[PDB]
Amino acid sequence: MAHFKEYQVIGRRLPTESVPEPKLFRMRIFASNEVIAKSRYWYFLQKLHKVKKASGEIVSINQINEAHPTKVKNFGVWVRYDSRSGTHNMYKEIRDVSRVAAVETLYQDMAARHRARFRSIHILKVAEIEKTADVKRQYVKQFLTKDLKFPLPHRVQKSTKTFSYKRPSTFY
Amino acid sequence: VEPVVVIDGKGHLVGRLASVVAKQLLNGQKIVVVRAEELNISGEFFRNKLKYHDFLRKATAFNKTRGPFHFRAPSRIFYKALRGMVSHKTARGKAALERLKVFEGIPPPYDKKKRVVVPQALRVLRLKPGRKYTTLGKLSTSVGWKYEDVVAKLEAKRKVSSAEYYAKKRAFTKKVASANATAAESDVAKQLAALGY
Amino acid sequence: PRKVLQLLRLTRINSGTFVKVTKATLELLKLIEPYVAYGYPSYSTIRQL
Amino acid sequence: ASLPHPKIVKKHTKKFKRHHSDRYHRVAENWRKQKGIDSVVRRRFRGNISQPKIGYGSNKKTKFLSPSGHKTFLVANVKDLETLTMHTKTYAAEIAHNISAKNRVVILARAKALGIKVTNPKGRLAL
Amino acid sequence: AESHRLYVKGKHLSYQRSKRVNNPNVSLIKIEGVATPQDAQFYLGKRIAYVYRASKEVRGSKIRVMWGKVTRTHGNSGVVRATFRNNLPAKTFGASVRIFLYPSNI
Amino acid sequence: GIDHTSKQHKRSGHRTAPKSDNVYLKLLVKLYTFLARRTDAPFNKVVLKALFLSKINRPPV
Amino acid sequence: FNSSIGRTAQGKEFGVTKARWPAKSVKFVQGLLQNAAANAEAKGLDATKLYVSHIQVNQAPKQRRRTYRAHGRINKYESSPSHIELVVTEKEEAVAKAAEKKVVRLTSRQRGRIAAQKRIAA
Amino acid sequence: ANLFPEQQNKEIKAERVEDQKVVDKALIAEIKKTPLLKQYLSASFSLKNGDKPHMLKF
Amino acid sequence: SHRKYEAPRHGHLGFLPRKRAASIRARVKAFPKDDRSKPVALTSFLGY
RNA sequence: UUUGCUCCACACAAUAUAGAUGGAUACGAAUAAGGCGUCCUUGUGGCGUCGCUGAACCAUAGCAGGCUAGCAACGGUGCACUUGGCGGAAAGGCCUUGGGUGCUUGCUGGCGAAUUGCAAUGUCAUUUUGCGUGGGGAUAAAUCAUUUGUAUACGACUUAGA
RNA sequence: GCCCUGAAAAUGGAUGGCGCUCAAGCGUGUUACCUAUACUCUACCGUCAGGGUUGAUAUGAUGCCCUGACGAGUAGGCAGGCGUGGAGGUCAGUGACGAAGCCUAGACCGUAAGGUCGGGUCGAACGGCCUCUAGUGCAGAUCUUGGUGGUAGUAGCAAAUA
RNA sequence: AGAACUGGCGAUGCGGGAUGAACCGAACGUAGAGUUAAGGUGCCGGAAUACACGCUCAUCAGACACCACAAAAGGUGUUAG
User: Fold this and answer.
1) Which residues have CB under 8 Å from A72's CB, separation 6+?
2) Across the interface, do C12 and F2 touch by the CB < 8 Å criterion?
3) Which domains does chain B have, with CATH numbers?
4) According to a count of CB atoms within 10 Å of the terminal CB, is the N or C end of chain D lower?
């Protein structure tokens, strides 16, 4: 694969004689490829209404992009998953001016602040919030203070050549 | 870049510096290390200490005579962080290592000549702020090496000498800098100023 | 899975070909899935192929 | 002379000395594919004397060809040299090790005459 | 004035090994000022000869040479693969070879 | 390698030479063979395979 | 021929602190060294700078004898004789030379650098 | 190969010599227009410690 | 199988090898700490 | 002992090379701070400046750099001397005084090279040794043989005998 | 989850070693690079396979030449081969102007089995090709006979006083 | 000790897991040159001292299938929930 892309997959099973023009459903899948996109749409639909790639078809495999990626996206996550034992539930607030990567910080946050593989992960509600108070996590409300700025010490300079002859400082 | 290169020790993290050295060694660049005692390490001294104790009990029982040799000297300890990090059994390796000369303090030859500072070792580069580090000093002090102050004082010497040599060199190239100012304004200067150098 | 590939042309490793998409031969594919890699070929491809 | 033959390559010219003739003097260098159930040589182990597999045979176009381009034939006496009389560019007369200097030199004259390219001219002939 | 080097210092490394056996035909080489593999293409193909010294004079000289040439950018920090009219004795490992700048394309 | 779906180096078997040491017999062959090539006619292909035959595929008629 | 025999300082003039003193050995080595000085004169050479260069010895036909081992056994105790012979060679100094000349072979780009020498200097 | 290296007895012919002047004449005429040109050529060239050939533009 | 009766050893290990010290002359393997606040004098001495 | 040894300036038969080809090119500590200049009211300092790689700084044009002239300066600058001073951590190497001498590319001139045939390291280092140069210096010890015990299987240790 | 607790045995010691601490460690996404008797394209080989081919003032059509494919392998099977003792046949072959044997960090042919040649050695009968004939090929059998060793100038020759 | 399906070994080298008959990738005439498996890219050793999100200090860290063991029961250590 690679990095995520939100796909607008809309399936309606496989229309038969008695089931012409089925009800139809739009489930949102993530991943970089479309084959891995439809694979996820069918397992998830393999968890709702009785089917498999054998009894139904995903009408289309569309894409999804942000209409205003110049504003800071203060997202509020919601996810379901398993564990090296059973299964649990969770909620976060990952910020980023891009949906798919806020979800990558998640698939990484699952393997980092919990050590859990992508497989063991079903992402659900991902809705940016408006009002500052609506924001729960204060370590996300950490960058909401009015009139803000901030510096960064110990600039560990990248060495392209082996031996240096200055023995550098933290200047930054 | 230079035939038999030099290496300043203070700051460097034992391991990182050990491999860049073993590389240039089995490559053909004769290199010598200096001040293996100001050679910073990691975590707390007690840890590494107890770890050295491991090499201290490791020896042949039927004859401690022909057993692993646990060199106490801060330099001899680093020579082991290369010994097992290169083929010192092969004709190539034995002599490959020969380009190597590890030294304590900054002896006379290497104090008049420039000493190199490698970023991939220097603590202020391969370590996290607040995360405790160690020093070859305190370890050797309590492991078998008994020349701590011996060198410690030879630096109060070697250092005090090359120290006032810079105060000279400082104001030397201080008025040589006022000569660079009154060397411009001319075309030979205006020209080279736009021609790169 | 061995005969499937013997009797589906692919005699020696890293070798490929085509088959008409039909539930008939469609079953061989899901029988030796961890033995190959397939997909819908494009004009450009087939040509050079 | 000879003919327009491609480069005479043999790939692995190094004799295939029997396994252990270098260890025992009772074992000659005369190759023999060891039959034993253990034999590292027979089981073909990375770092063992490779056996004479036919994949080492010589290219048909240059098989039997000396670096020159003359396939050494074994000449006997007078009548026997007149054999390759018409092959001065693709065959060579190698005089039999069992030839008396008397009859030996007489043949060498017949050789230079017909353009008979001989390989062992110093044969019993003092220099 | 004092400089007569038109080639560059090519520090000779190991043949073409893995963890086990090596390749006694194509050796791997390093060179002065080569870091960017993108801009490492410049030294590609450039013929290279190692200058070693002998005892018994050959053709009026006792300074023989085994010849070679550049092939493709190996590694990711300015390394280079090379072959030879004759492979090196292995005992030459870890030296400094002469990499001339021809054929050119500047 | 290649999946040996069929035995490798399968000697065709059916004799394409007589185990005869008698030249005359072999000549009939050289003749009939030549026939069973240019003539592109069925009949000789049969006699061509027939001369090879043992004292059994050549029983007394 | 050491094979588990003790030392003896008298043999330290050879750096090898290991030796012995073979008596019946010399008894016959002098009987021959006397015979060689005898034949150096029989021809009439300079019986002075006579430096011996070829002294080699090889085992002789093992004289059969035997000892009686326990449990009625018969193990060999054969005499181990030898075959020596040295050549007393005159020591004439001087050698000078007599070897090769090396017919210098060069190329055009090699003989051209010879003329390039007569341009630099003279 | 029976003299080597008995000087020359084969030096030059002034034929090729003359031809040179019958060239540089107009070449050095354009040099007396762009400053330091002769100076640039009156020198050789070799790789110095510190400079990168692949990065150097020519 | 342990000894049979946990007992003491036979010979200080520190005092080894039993190698015959260089020569009949005893080598002084150490000397007293110096005090530069007192008069000069020796520390060792010979004897038979 | 046939004049055997050895230091220094070089020179020539050699000898091998773990691998010269502009330059190993001197603060120390700080690394959640400092380098330099700088100045005031002398410091854990008022003020400016700076890194952000050495991709620096220096070297660097001439028959492997020849032969000759002059201008502007007397700088810089190699060899061989010397002097003030210093270095013992393996000093054995470094800073300096006054000269002699070499050269100058800081500028302007003026002759030179080809045929190494369009490439062939195309040889310009130093390590060490040898029979012969000649400018000085230098006149032993060791073992073995007898001997001793504080010695020991023997070697060895150990003291002794012009 | 991560880290410690849980966490004790015998020769000192193994994330393979060294070494690793915003890692080279646990998880993970992007990667770029790294090299299998494998696959890629190819040269050559033998076998098998499907073919074209006598055309003569020649031949081996058990030939020549073409296209494709393939090569693991003990026990094991049959094919093509090499060598060796005598027999009938034959190259009116070898040969006291050196056959056989033998030695040969000398050369050639063959995948090879072996053949061939240079030199020494040596002194009397021997090789090729076509068949025939077999007491026909040795590293092994605590293999037989005869030979020679490392052990080894070692153990040790020491009772009947000396 | 014993059964079944398939696979191997035996009898099959090879490159990988330090190492090994069985596993991972893979099979072999001889070579040439590309590309990869497997397996890895501090160093030993061919290959990033690559980049991004993290977590984690241990006066007994951990550090990759088979595989060379660790369990119940705990921590106001520290993070996420």
Assistant:
1) A95, A97
2) yes
3) 1-147 (3.90.1180.10), 148-197 (1.20.5.4280)
4) C
